[PDB]
Protein backbone atom coordinates (compact mmCIF):
# COMPACT_ATOMS: atom_id res chain seq x y z
CA UNK A 1 0.00 0.00 0.00
CA UNK A 2 1.64 3.29 -1.03
CA UNK A 3 0.37 5.76 1.61
CA UNK A 4 1.11 5.04 5.23
CA UNK A 5 -1.32 6.13 7.90
CA UNK A 6 -0.91 9.87 8.24
CA UNK A 7 -2.23 9.75 11.79
CA UNK A 8 -5.01 12.17 10.86
CA UNK A 9 -8.61 11.33 11.90
CA UNK A 10 -7.66 10.09 15.42
CA UNK A 11 -9.91 8.94 18.35
CA UNK A 12 -9.67 8.63 22.17
CA UNK A 13 -10.03 5.16 23.77
CA UNK A 14 -12.56 4.80 26.61
CA UNK A 15 -14.02 8.29 26.80
CA UNK A 16 -16.66 8.40 29.51
CA UNK A 17 -18.89 11.39 30.16
CA UNK A 18 -19.19 13.23 33.45
CA UNK A 19 -20.72 11.00 36.11
CA UNK A 20 -24.40 11.76 36.60
CA UNK A 21 -26.01 10.28 39.69
CA UNK A 22 -29.67 9.39 39.28
CA UNK A 23 -30.29 9.07 43.03
CA UNK A 24 -30.13 12.91 43.27
CA UNK A 25 -28.32 13.28 46.61
CA UNK A 26 -29.69 15.56 49.32
CA UNK A 27 -28.74 19.22 49.33
CA UNK A 28 -25.90 20.22 51.61
CA UNK A 29 -26.85 22.21 54.67
CA UNK A 30 -25.06 25.44 55.48
CA UNK A 31 -22.20 26.06 57.94
CA UNK A 32 -23.25 29.54 59.16
CA UNK A 33 -26.09 29.82 61.65
CA UNK A 34 -29.10 32.06 61.01
CA UNK A 35 -28.50 35.69 61.96
CA UNK A 36 -31.23 36.13 64.53
CA UNK A 37 -31.45 39.08 66.87
CA UNK A 38 -28.12 40.93 66.93
CA UNK A 39 -28.41 42.64 70.31
CA UNK A 40 -31.10 40.78 72.29
CA UNK A 41 -30.06 37.24 71.47
CA UNK A 42 -31.18 34.18 73.47
CA UNK A 43 -34.07 35.66 75.47
CA UNK A 44 -34.23 38.05 78.41
CA UNK A 45 -35.73 36.07 81.39
CA UNK A 46 -37.82 38.72 83.14
CA UNK A 47 -38.07 38.41 86.96
CA UNK A 48 -41.04 38.64 89.32
CA UNK B 1 -32.57 29.50 52.70
CA UNK B 2 -35.63 27.35 52.96
CA UNK B 3 -36.52 25.14 55.94
CA UNK B 4 -32.85 24.89 56.84
CA UNK B 5 -32.95 28.53 57.93
CA UNK B 6 -35.60 27.69 60.54
CA UNK B 7 -33.75 24.64 61.87
CA UNK B 8 -30.69 26.64 62.62
CA UNK B 9 -32.68 29.42 64.30
CA UNK B 10 -32.12 27.54 67.49
CA UNK B 11 -31.58 28.86 70.97
CA UNK B 12 -32.54 29.03 74.63
CA UNK B 13 -36.27 29.34 74.00
CA UNK B 14 -36.32 26.16 72.05
CA UNK B 15 -35.14 24.09 74.94
CA UNK B 16 -38.61 23.82 76.47
CA UNK B 17 -39.91 22.51 73.14
CA UNK B 18 -37.12 20.37 71.65
CA UNK B 19 -34.25 19.92 74.14
CA UNK B 20 -33.74 16.32 75.24
CA UNK B 21 -36.58 15.36 72.83
CA UNK B 22 -38.89 12.57 73.85
CA UNK B 23 -40.97 12.03 70.74
CA UNK B 24 -41.06 12.51 67.05
CA UNK B 25 -43.86 13.10 64.71
CA UNK B 26 -42.38 11.41 61.75
CA UNK B 27 -42.95 7.82 62.62
CA UNK B 28 -46.25 6.41 63.77
CA UNK B 29 -46.27 3.40 65.92
CA UNK B 30 -49.35 1.42 65.22
CA UNK B 31 -50.49 -1.05 67.85
CA UNK B 32 -50.88 -4.72 66.77
CA UNK B 33 -54.37 -5.79 67.79
CA UNK B 34 -56.41 -8.89 68.21
CA UNK B 35 -57.93 -10.60 65.22
CA UNK B 36 -61.62 -10.00 64.70
CA UNK B 37 -64.46 -9.54 62.22
CA UNK B 38 -67.79 -7.67 62.28
CA UNK B 39 -71.08 -9.15 60.90
CA UNK B 40 -74.54 -7.65 60.58
CA UNK B 41 -77.17 -10.26 61.43
CA UNK B 42 -80.96 -9.87 61.44
CA UNK B 43 -82.77 -10.68 64.68
CA UNK B 44 -86.30 -12.05 65.01
CA UNK B 45 -88.93 -9.64 66.29
CA UNK B 46 -91.54 -11.12 68.57
CA UNK B 47 -94.97 -9.48 68.46
CA UNK B 48 -96.78 -7.50 65.80
* Interface probe, candidates B8, B10, B12, chain A, greatest A C-beta count within 10 A: B8
Residue B15: closest CA among chain A residues belongs to which residue? A42
CA dist B46 → A44, A45, B39, B42, B43 (Å): 76, 74, 22, 13, 10
Taking CB atoms and an 8 Å cutoff, what residues of chain A touch B12?
42-43
**DSSP code for B8:** T
Taking alpha carbons only, the member of B37, B2, B46, B4 closest to residue A31 is B4
- The pair phi, psi for residue B15, each rounded to 5°, is -60, -45
* Residue B4 and residue A30 in contact, taking contact as beta carbons nearer than 8 Å: yes
Helix, strand, coil shares of chain A, percent, nearest 5, are 0, 0, 100
Q: Is A42 on the interface with B (CB under 8 A)?
A: yes
Say how many residues make up chain B: 48
What distance in Å separates the CA atoms of residue B8 and residue B34, rounded to the nearest whole number? 44
**Deposited resolution, Å:** 3.5
Amino acid sequence: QPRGYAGLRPYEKNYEGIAEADVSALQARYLDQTRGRPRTGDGDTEPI
Amino acid sequence: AGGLSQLVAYGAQDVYLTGNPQITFFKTVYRRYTNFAIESIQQTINGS
